[PDB]
Design a protein around this ligand. Sequence first.
Ligand SMILES: CN(C)C(=O)c1cccc2c1-c1ccccc1C2=O
Length: 289
Amino acid sequence: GRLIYTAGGYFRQSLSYLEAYNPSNGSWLRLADLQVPRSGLAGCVVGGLLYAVGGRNNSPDGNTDSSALDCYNPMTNQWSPCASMSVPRNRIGVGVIDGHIYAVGGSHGCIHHSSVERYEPERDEWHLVAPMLTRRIGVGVAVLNRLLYAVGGFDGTNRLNSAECYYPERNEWRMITPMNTIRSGAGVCVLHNCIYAAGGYDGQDQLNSVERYDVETETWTFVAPMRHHRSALGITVHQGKIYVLGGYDGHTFLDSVECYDPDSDTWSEVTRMTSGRSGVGVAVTMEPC
Ligand SMILES: CN(C)C(=O)c1cccc2c1-c1ccccc1C2=O
């Protein structure tokens, strides 16, 4: 029994919610709040533990960018602090390779990071690796065939259609084919042999378009668009289908969750979050307790 966990997010202020959705029965489960509210974080799972990485606490009494790594154990329904990153990273992207967590990009105040660092759970240590060729915040990140991809974002001046790939054994980043669309704050994930980029902000509008990169052919192709335009959406894959959660459509903070079936190239509404929000962290692991 595997669940889609959504951590944090933003509506009026940064949120502390941890809620888990069960696609087998449509149920939502409210779980232990984050110790610190945060939006613009990323979520990921290593060894059945859920991790919340980076973000920012937008609060009535201040805005604090987060370098925090916090671990959630579903067996205990408890959050524990882990080692903090070298720098705060708001609107971060993360990916997991070989049990290690890679933190990519993000902002610290007006600083837009190209820097990248790697967490080793068995030592509770972060270490910096080679930086990206481009500064990227609102960057989408995914892992395919043990290579790490950084897609889109904002470099401080322009929103980006560019993307690049990290080769761990060479500690080296290389540009890949750019997307067909400029996207900041897109949902980026992997399904089969393709990197998907859904939604985001192109500098003028929130997008509903979706495109995917075939690593073998090195081309981006559009698929069916989402039913809702959305930036700052959460995304994950669960049993061969993409789920997108919430985001901002220029008018509302969405509670809509949509599901993409790649066999039929269609999106359907599958549930609503308990409240509209953007900038969530999302990951999949076992059900709690
Ligand atoms: C920058 N960008 C990726 C946006 O989508 C965006 C653009 C203009 C205004 C806003 C946003 C945005 C994104 C998420 C939460 C709130 C906002 C806003 O007020």
